Amino acid sequence: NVPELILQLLQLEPEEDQVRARIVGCLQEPAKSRSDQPAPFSLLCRMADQTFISIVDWARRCMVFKELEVADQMTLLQNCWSELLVLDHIYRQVQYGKEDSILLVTGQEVELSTVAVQAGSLLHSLVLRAQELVLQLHALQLDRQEFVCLKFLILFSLDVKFLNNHSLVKDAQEKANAALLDYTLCHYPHCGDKFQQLLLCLVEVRALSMQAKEYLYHKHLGNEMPRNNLLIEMLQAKQ
């Protein structure tokens, strides 16, 4: 009753538990986060960097992606890095299920009231917009099967004309769209066009991700980002 592609993707999807353990292990020292109050900008930047590293590791193990040459792999990730990070954050909130706070991959909970106090207008806007998307996805009853399929769809969202291996990626794109459509129609028949609604949510994720890139660019110009930051490397798209 579940498409093969989704069954395979579920087998590659880590437990929110292990990802947390992995990242906290790569992150953690002492000065902020622990203490709570106030909030470490540099630490959160490293946390986001480590989250993307976890995402890259997932991609490397993925069917199809693992068959591509490094050049094609880099091009795909350069096109979807921000969207994968935003979707990751949003799904974490969907499962968290709290409208007055946000859950970080490290397990840290941040009150939205705290964001209103500490964040500038741009970031505050981003956080609030992501929460609106969380509400939409909660109402749509987004489940794990759909989430992993959406991640795969985002990973291969690039037009094949930008890659060396066209046939392989083209088939993956068709398979992913077919799987999400089939799964949603069979498991949520009373949500007429859940498939289309999820695709529209991806349009929203893309718009939000662009705004996130603008936030990062602002930080970059102000020399506020840690040196050798991976997200900034991705923002520069020069690899």
Partner: peptide, 12 residues
């Protein structure tokens, strides 16, 4: 052309 991304994908 060494980049962080490249080191993550080229097993090294």
């Amino acid at each position: 052309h060494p980049t962080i991304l490249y080191t993550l994908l080229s097993p090294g």
